[PDB]
C-alpha cells in the first residue's frame, strides 16, 4: 500500500517543472516552451 | 462548495453551476487486452479478454 501511495503522491510533484497539471502548461505558454516543460514532466513521471 | 476531490487531488465530483445538481465523474474507460489462443498449428482463431 505504501508503494501505491508513493507512486501516486508524485503525480503532484512538478519535478522542478512549471506545474504538475499538463493543461496549465498547455493552455498558458507557447507550444514550443510547452513542449519543453511537458517533456520534463513526461520523463520525471516515467522515472517513477 | 462547488467541486470535490478523490484520494488524490483529481476532481471527481462537481456541483453543476447551472442547476446546483451534484454530479459525479467516472473515468471514461480503459484497460488491458488479453488474447486467448489454442495455438497456431491447431487453429487460427482467438478469444479476447
Ligand atoms: C436556471 O434558472 C432558471 C430560473 O432562474 C430555472 O428555472 C426554474 O426552474 C425551477 C425548477 O424546475 C422551477 O421551480 C422554477 O419555476 C423555474 N423558474 C423559471 C423562471 O423558469 C432553471 O431551472 C435553471 N436551469 C436549470 C438547468 O435548472
Curated annotation (Swiss-Prot), chain A:
Domain of life of the source: Viruses
Ranges in coiled-coil conformation: 1-38
Function: Acts as a viral fusion peptide which is unmasked following S2 cleavage occurring upon virus endocytosis.
Protein name: Spike protein S2'
Name of the gene encoding the protein in the UniProt record: S
